[PDB]
Amino acid sequence: LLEKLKKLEEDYYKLRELYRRLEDEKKFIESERIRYEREVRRLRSEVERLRSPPLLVGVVSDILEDGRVVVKSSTGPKFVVNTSQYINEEELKPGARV
Amino acid sequence: LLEKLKKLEEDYYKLRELYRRLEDEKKFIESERIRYEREVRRLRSEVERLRSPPLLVGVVSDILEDGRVVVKSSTGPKFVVNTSQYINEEELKPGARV
């Protein structure tokens, strides 16, 4: 009765004060998440401007081992351009169109 | 008394529960926050590499005594271009890819 309720009321009081603090801290963390989630879409869109037209046919010419790829363009030049993790030199071999 | 204790015990349990349900929901968000951060930085780095304008391939077909370098381009026309300060013209001779 007097003893029984009192112990349960005490427990609930101390825990609430802990949980209120933790709730407040995570409320700020949520702002940052929306900031970062939006920045991700923005950046992915920069990748897609390349992936969208105009597109031009090239055929891998050869591969440098400093992580660059030489491609002979159908336009004319052999030119050297740097690679990505989106598409790797392990998915390119000379004579394959890209 | 006993009645008083009941009202107080109820309020502290209900608020305890409120803060903890919110706490977990935002723990999900916290995970997301770290996950999209990594995706910004890695997206950003790679977008720089592709976007890059290339460096064209040419071959020193001949080389001049006037400090100038006779470079047959892979565009098609011939050009006579200036050797940098950084590369020497002892490192440049017929058949030197540039």
How many residues in total does chain A contain?
A: 98
- Write out chain A in H/E/C secondary structure: CHHHHHHHHHHHHHHHHHHHHHHHHHHHHHHHHHHHHHHHHHHHHHHHHHHCCCCCCEEEEEECCCCEEEEEECCCCEEEEECCCCCCHHHCCCCCEC
Could you give the maximum distance between any two Cα atoms of chain A, in Å? Answer: 92
> Is the separation of the CB atoms in B27 and B33 below 8 Å?
no
| Contacts with B, A 58-87, CB within 8 Å | 70, 76-86
* Cα distances (Å, whole numbers) of residue A76 to A8, A18, A56, B74, B76: 82, 69, 11, 7, 7
This structure's resolution (Å) is 6.9
| CB neighbourhood size of B2 (10 A) | 9
3-state secondary structure of B40: helix
Region of A95 on the Ramachandran plot (φ > 0 left; ψ -120 to 50 alpha; else beta): left
The neighbouring-strand residues paired with B72 are B59, B78
Contact A61, A94 (CB under 8 A): yes
Task: Give the residue on A whose Cα is nearest the Cα of B15.
Answer: A16
Cross-strand pairs, B68 = B82
Q: Tell me the C-alpha distance between B69 and A64, whole Å.
A: 24
For residues A59-92, one letter each, b for 16 or more C-beta atoms within 10 angstroms of the residue's C-beta and e for the rest, the string is ebbebeeeebbbbbbeeebbbbbbbbeeeeeeeb
What CA–CA distance (Å, rounded) separates B79 from B74?
A: 11
The method recorded for this entry reads: cryo-EM
Q: Which helix (H) or strand (E) holds B7?
A: helix B2-51
| Rounded (10°) angle between helices A2-51 and B2-51 | 20
Our CA-based measurement puts residue B79 at a distance from the nearest CA of chain A, in whole angstroms, of: 14
A22 interface with B at CB cutoff 8 Å: yes
- The sign one gets for the Cα dihedral B74, B78, B84, B90 is positive
User: Is B37 in Cβ contact with A84 (below 8 Å)?
Assistant: no
Residue with tokens 């071999």: A93
Rounded to whole angstroms, the Cα distance separating B34 from A33 reads: 8
- Residue B23 has φ and ψ, to the nearest 5°, of -60, -50
The Cα A84–Cα B88 span in angstroms is 31
Burial environment of residue B56 by CB neighbours within 10 A (0 to 12, 13 to 18, 19 or more): middle
